[PDB]
Amino acid sequence: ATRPLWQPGVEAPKHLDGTMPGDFGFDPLNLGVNKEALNWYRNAELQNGRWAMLGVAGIVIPAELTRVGVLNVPEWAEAGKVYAESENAIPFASLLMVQLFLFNFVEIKRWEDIKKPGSQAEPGSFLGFESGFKGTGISGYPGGAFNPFGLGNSSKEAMDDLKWREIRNGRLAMVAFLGFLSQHAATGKGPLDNLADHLADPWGANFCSNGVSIPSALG
Amino acid sequence: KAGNWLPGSETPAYLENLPASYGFDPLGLAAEPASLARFRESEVFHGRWAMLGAAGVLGVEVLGYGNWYDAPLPLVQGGQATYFGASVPFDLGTLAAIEFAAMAGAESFRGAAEPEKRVYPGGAFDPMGMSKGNSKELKTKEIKNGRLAMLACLGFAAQHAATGASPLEALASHLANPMAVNFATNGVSLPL
Amino acid sequence: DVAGLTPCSESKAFAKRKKNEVKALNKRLKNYEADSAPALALKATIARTEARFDKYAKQGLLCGTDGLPHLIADPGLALRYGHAGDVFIPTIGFIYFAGWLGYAGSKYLQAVAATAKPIEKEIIIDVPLAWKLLWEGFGWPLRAFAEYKNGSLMEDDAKITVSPR
Amino acid sequence: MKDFTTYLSTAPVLTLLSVTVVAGLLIEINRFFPDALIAAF
Amino acid sequence: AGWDLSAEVPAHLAGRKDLAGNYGFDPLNLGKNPEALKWYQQAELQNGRWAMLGVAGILVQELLHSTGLGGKAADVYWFDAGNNTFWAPKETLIAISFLMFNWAELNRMQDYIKPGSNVTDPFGNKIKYVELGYPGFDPLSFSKNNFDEWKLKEIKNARLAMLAFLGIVAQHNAQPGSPLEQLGAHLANPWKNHFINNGVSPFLTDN
Ligand code: CLA
Ligand code: CLA
Ligand SMILES: CC1=C[C@H](O)CC(C)(C)[C@H]1/C=C/C(C)=C/C=C/C(C)=C/C=C/C=C(C)/C=C/C=C(C)/C=C/C1=C(C)C[C@H](O)CC1(C)C
Ligand SMILES: CC1=C[C@H](O)CC(C)(C)[C@H]1/C=C/C(C)=C/C=C/C(C)=C/C=C/C=C(C)/C=C/C=C(C)/C=C/C1=C(C)C[C@H](O)CC1(C)C
Ligand SMILES: CC1=C[C@H](O)CC(C)(C)[C@H]1/C=C/C(C)=C/C=C/C(C)=C/C=C/C=C(C)/C=C/C=C(C)/C=C/C1=C(C)C[C@H](O)CC1(C)C
Ligand SMILES: NCC(=O)NCC(=O)O
């Protein structure tokens, strides 16, 4: 209860005890007052953070490599159109449907794990692979086939440290992807281009000069 | 056991009396006894078919009859397949139908037996009767040769996905110029 | 062209209506001196009218037989033809904002219902509590769906008064 | 000022101030963003 | 306390005397967690040893470049070392480097997760093992006497060489030429030639 909070002076809400990774007591809208809704929101936070970490990596590492003359990857916002003009390009609707079908199969299993944490581990499910879906008792942290290197499964507090690192990195990358979307919506340049322009003149190059954030009607 | 996969490690308890066991299961896929029981037969079956496939590709390339990739290429384009110069007037539909019927019959009449009988049978499959008289090290040899054959077959697939040449042609080119003709030199394996 | 309607960017009657409005305002202009306050007011009105007509032509609205913008209230028919801002996007906006207000009022009712005098709290509103619940009502859809899945949003019929048929 | 703020918290004062601030916000929205027929983003 | 007089050792650097170069320097307290401190000690040994090897290579090759011993192989700048043809191209060199360093570093990590479990080779030969990051690779035997002092000398040289390589990359990205040439150009005046008079370091001066 004495952990650092999102406001030194504001006590944590009674539904945020401190057990969850990354619980800084931040819930001013009280969205997680229901415990089952809180568990669903924790799983949603894990999924959004992991997908944002993957997406932000796939944005900022190829863009940086293009900046230093490696691989030469186009802008992330126009990378869909760059591939869609290829001579052997899969059509957009067909590719989306294939991705959605595979993700349907995978994430309905993940959903059933969210309900009962030991769902998919029952015998006779797969073809001998059901043993890898035992889970660790907390949904969103499967283990088994996932986590091959077995990082953190040694001292329990080692896994809690890695859980906090994961949740902070996921939140940072979610904020970063929101920044990427808003930066490209306002300025037709990449995230590294926006960063380089800001270092040229921080008082001149920012969100108050794109003309899209602050509306021109007010000023 | 003979081996431990890593030189120094904790060993899974369910991988000791198994032939050709090195304790290699970091994912823990065979923690359940039924999972191990099915996966053992799966590994034996995969190794046997991989040995058959590796023998097929090596014998189709070194005997000078063609490439393994180009085997079903003349199956369309009009028709007429090739096997030792035989005309074989079978089209694509009848060939697939006969193969499906044969495989369905063989596999249905196969995997309806006992767990030991599904993977390790006798009768007409060992006519010379040398399964008797120390079968553990022979099983170990079978599993190890099967693993080597699976590695060879997946290497053939990945190599033809990469450079796109023949297996023995790529081997000859690698022996001729080991500097610029490796897996690393083409722009598909090492991007940096 | 979604239902026999032409875009107002190319429909002639839209330009005719804009010209008629600007000409009427110019007829109003032609009575004062150039720099008078009525002249500035009429110039501002003209600028607003031209900006409105140019914006309506820019946004891609549909005009009918004459130059009046028409809105499409069918999803799909407005999504694939690019007129979701006519009805669909304001539908989502109203649903969100009305749910915010209604959920804030609901949570105020259930918060003051379990007090000493719920009668007094509805004419004498606890302003900090109302402000807090108005802020919390911005996450109304997720909260409402969670309470619906929990079953705490609706009341059992056996605890609700009815008439004796 | 407890009684004065309680009077300010009474239903008519609060509803008149609330409709006043809402109407003023909408009016200034139409002042800076006039003739918004559709939600064109 | 050793790194800073009138300062107190950060608790977890006090009771553990068996650390090479334990001078109490941890103001940000990175290794309060004992497992984190073990990881950071292994990272110390690895970074220090690779930096000693790297800085010795830079200094020796630049000495041979400035004086002149080797042929066209040694007559190139260290940052331009890839211009030579050598014996193998880039891709296969990087590939075999990946393979054999995977082998060696996985042996090292297998030692890390269980000390002494990986000292035996399939040939049957066995070696002695001591401590954790000190696997007893001592053929001519200088470890039998005052091993703490030798470890302290090693860790001091390792820290000096990590600082050296940080200096090498910073100088190279700041001023042109070889690091020995940069040292000589410093020694020229030396009141003017230093890191302030670069136009790339202070930024407050020369825009
Ligand atoms: C926030 C309070 C509140 C809430 C949550 C509801 C909710 C509901 N009302 Mg109701 N209503 C209210 C206040 C409220 N009403 C008031 C004050 C009146 C008197 C004018 C009415 C008169 C009324 C009638 C006659 C009917 C409903 C009906 C309904 C239901 C249909 C949906 C609807 O919006 O209808 C429309 C709602 C209105 C027209 C009234 C809205 C008045 C304002 C906007 C709400 C009050 C705001 C409140 C002061 C905010 C407090 C904030 C808090 C932080 C302090 C729905 C569940 C209908 C129904 O029974 O459906 C089956 C119906 O027939 N309402
Ligand atoms: C100036 C840009 C640049 C950069 C950034 C690199 C980077 C790298 N080179 Mg390369 N190289 C360059 C230019 C560059 N090179 C040039 C100009 C040439 C000659 C033309 C070469 C020729 C060359 C060869 C021949 C080889 C390399 C290799 C390597 C890798 C070292 C192996 C390793 O790190 O272990 C492995 C890494 C890990 C186990 C973990 C990944 C790294 C993470 C991020 C942790 C590392 C921390 C990080 C370094 C510290 C932060 C940055 C710090 C500088 C502030 C490395 C990633 C070697 C290689 O490919 O690997 C064997 C290799 O053999 N380079
Ligand atoms: C806490 C709380 C509670 C209280 O009570 C209240 C409040 C305040 C409300 C709160 C807050 C919240 C928030 C902040 C939220 C946010 C979120 C996000 C941002 C997410 C994202 C998230 C995000 C995500 C997933 C993302 C992902 C991404 C991706 C995949 C990407 C992809 C890609 C790439 C690679 C590149 C290419 O070329 C393109 C693409 C294809 C595009
Ligand atoms: C154990 C484990 C456990 C832990 O825990 C984890 C992990 C790591 C995951 C693991 C591992 C795994 C792996 C490695 C796997 C792999 C496999 C393989 C490779 C297979 C192949 C496999 C392979 C195979 C079958 C192959 C086969 C082949 C064939 C048939 C061929 C055929 C043919 C021929 C003759 C020739 C002609 O002209 C063509 C054709 C007709 C085509
Ligand atoms: C303690 C602490 C704690 C507290 O609390 C906080 C703080 C303050 C943060 C801290 C501190 C820290 C630091 C200072 C760190 C640093 C490190 C380093 C510098 C490393 C390096 C490290 C470094 C390294 C490894 C390096 C290495 C190098 C090398 C290999 C090189 C190589 C080479 C050669 C030979 C030659 C050729 O031609 C080129 C090349 C290829 C280039
Ligand atoms: N009862 C047959 C059976 O269990 N088959 C499993 C397999 O396909 O290996």
Query: Quick one: B30 exposed, middle or buried, by C-beta within 10 A (0-12, 13-18, 19+)?
Result: buried
Sequence-separated (6 or more) residues with CB below 8 Å from residue B102: none
The amino acid present at C136, given as its one-letter code, is E
Alpha helices per DSSP H over E68-146: 90-113
B118 backbone dihedrals φ, ψ, rounded to 5°: -70, -30
- SS3 sequence of D1-41: CHHHHHHHCEHHHHHHHHHHHHHHHHHHHHHHCCCCCCCCC
- C62-63, strands of its sheet edge to edge: C6-7, C62-63, C69-70
Break positions in chain A: residue before each gap, C to N over 2.5 angstroms: none
Distance CA A130, CA A124 (A): 7
Positive or negative, the CA dihedral A209, A211, A213, A218 is positive
Pairing mode, if any, of strands C62-63 and C69-70? antiparallel
Distance CA B23, CA B46 (A): 19
Tokens of E205: 């001066």
Distance CA C55, CA C48 (A): 10
Chain D residue numbers with beta carbons less than 8 Å from the beta carbon of C52 are 34-35
Q: Residue for token digits 């669903």? A: A40
Domain assignment of residue C29, given as a range: 1-165
Chain E residues 4-33 with a CB less than 8 Å from chain A: 33
How far, in whole angstroms, is CA E75 from its chain's centroid?
Answer: 24
Distance CA C75, CA C81 (A): 10
Strands (E), chain B: none
Q: Are B82 and B66 in contact (CB under 8 A)?
A: yes
Q: How far is D32 from chain A (nearest CA, A)?
A: 6
C-alpha distances out from residue B93 to A188, B77, E96, Å: 54, 14, 47
Query: Quick one: C67 exposed, middle or buried, by C-beta within 10 A (0-12, 13-18, 19+)?
Result: buried
The amino acid present at A99, given as its one-letter code, is Q
Q: Residue for token digits 């369905």? A: B104
Query: Of the candidates E185, E168, E156, which has an alpha carbon nearest to the alpha carbon of residue E61?
Result: E168
Sequence-separated (6 or more) residues with CB below 8 Å from residue B94: none
Distance CA E181, CA B75 (A): 70
Ramachandran class of E203: left when φ > 0, alpha when ψ lies in -120 to 50, beta otherwise:
left
Ligand 6 in reach of B41 Cβ (< 6 A): yes
- How many helical (H) and strand (E) elements, i.e. helices and strands, does chain E have? 4, 0
Q: How far is A33 from chain C (nearest CA, A)?
A: 9
Give the helix, strand, coil percentages of chain B, each rounded to 5: 50, 0, 50
Distance CA A213, CA A206 (A): 10
The amino acid present at A125, given as its one-letter code, is S
Positive or negative, the CA dihedral A196, A197, A200, A201 is negative
**Could you tell me how many residues make up chain A?**
219
**Which of E35, E90, E94 to mutate: most A Cβ within 10 Å?**
E35
Cα Rg of chain E, angstroms = 21
In chain C, the number of structural domains is: 1
Pairing mode, if any, of strands C6-7 and C69-70? unpaired
Query: Of the candidates E182, A54, A135, which has an alpha carbon nearest to the alpha carbon of residue B28?
Result: A135
Which helix H or strand E contains B57, and what residues bound it? helix B33-62
Q: Are B178 and B186 in contact (CB under 8 A)?
A: no
- How many helical (H) and strand (E) elements, i.e. helices and strands, does chain B have? 5, 0
Query: Of the candidates E161, E131, E156, which has an alpha carbon nearest to the alpha carbon of residue E143?
Result: E131
Distance CA C136, CA B178 (A): 69
C-alpha distances out from residue C14 to C8, C47, C57, D39, Å: 6, 17, 9, 20
Q: Are A140 and A47 in contact (CB under 8 A)?
A: yes
Alpha helices per DSSP H over chain C: 12-29, 37-59, 88-113, 127-136, 140-150
The amino acid present at C51, given as its one-letter code, is A
Q: How far is A195 from chain C (nearest CA, A)?
A: 32
C7 backbone dihedrals φ, ψ, rounded to 5°: -60, 145
Which helix H or strand E contains C6, and what residues bound it? strand C6-7
Sequence-separated (6 or more) residues with CB below 8 Å from residue E174: E195, E198, E200, E201
Distance CA B89, CA B95 (A): 10
Distance CA B118, CA B59 (A): 29
**Could you tell me how many residues make up chain C?**
165
Report which protein residue has its CA nearest ligand 2's atom 8: B192
C-alpha distances out from residue B176 to B173, B185, B188, B189, E93, Å: 5, 15, 21, 21, 18
C74 is in an annotated binding site: yes
Distance CA A215, CA D13 (A): 34
Chain-chain contact of C51 with D35 (C-beta, under 8 angstroms): yes
Q: Are B119 and B41 in contact (CB under 8 A)?
A: yes
Distance CA C125, CA D11 (A): 7
Distance CA B2, CA B137 (A): 11
DSSP three-state, residue B117: helix
Cα Rg of chain D, angstroms = 16
Query: Of the candidates C137, C10, C124, which has an alpha carbon nearest to the alpha carbon of residue C62?
Result: C10
Q: Are B120 and B24 in contact (CB under 8 A)?
A: no
Q: Are B2 and B140 in contact (CB under 8 A)?
A: yes
C-alpha distances out from residue C46 to B166, C49, C51, C55, Å: 78, 5, 8, 14
Which helix H or strand E contains B164, and what residues bound it? none
Chain E residue numbers with beta carbons less than 8 Å from the beta carbon of A161 are 33
Query: Quick one: B58 exposed, middle or buried, by C-beta within 10 A (0-12, 13-18, 19+)?
Result: middle
Sequence-separated (6 or more) residues with CB below 8 Å from residue E156: E21
Q: What is the resolution of this structure in A?
A: 3.2
Q: Are C72 and C62 in contact (CB under 8 A)?
A: yes
Reply yes or no: is the peptide bond before residue A142 cis, omega within 30 of 0: no
Sequence-separated (6 or more) residues with CB below 8 Å from residue A152: A158, A159, A161, A162, A163
Q: Are A148 and A171 in contact (CB under 8 A)?
A: no
Distance CA E145, CA E130 (A): 14
DSSP three-state, residue E86: coil
- How many helical (H) and strand (E) elements, i.e. helices and strands, does chain A have? 5, 0
DSSP three-state, residue A100: helix
Chain C residues 73-132 with a CB less than 8 Å from chain D: 83, 85-86, 89-90, 93, 122-127
Q: Are B81 and B89 in contact (CB under 8 A)?
A: no
Query: Of the candidates C46, C3, C52, C2, which has an alpha carbon nearest to the alpha carbon of residue C24?
Result: C46
- List ligand 4's pocket residues with C-beta within 6 A: B 24-27, 29, 46, 49-50, 53, 56-57, 60, 68, 71, 150-151, 153-154
Q: Are D38 and C86 in contact (CB under 8 A)?
A: yes
Q: Residue for token digits 């040439």? A: E181
Distance CA A43, CA A37 (A): 10
Sequence-separated (6 or more) residues with CB below 8 Å from residue C72: C2, C3, C62, C78, C81, C83, C86, C87
Distance CA A200, CA A205 (A): 8
Positive or negative, the CA dihedral E121, E127, E128, E131 is negative
**CB atoms near residue C91 (< 10 Å):** 14
Which helix H or strand E contains B74, and what residues bound it? none
Query: Which residues make beta-bridge pairs with C70?
Result: C62
Distance CA C22, CA C157 (A): 62
DSSP per position, B95-142: HHHHHHHHHHHHHHHHTTS-HHHHHS--GGGSTT--SSS--HHHHHHH
Distance CA B171, CA B156 (A): 11
Ligand 6 in reach of B144 Cβ (< 6 A): no
The amino acid present at E145, given as its one-letter code, is N
DSSP three-state, residue E62: helix
Query: Of the candidates B160, B151, B150, B152, which has an alpha carbon nearest to the alpha carbon of residue B49?
Result: B150
Q: Residue for token digits 């590492």? A: A61
Query: Of the candidates B109, B99, B138, which has an alpha carbon nearest to the alpha carbon of residue B20?
Result: B138
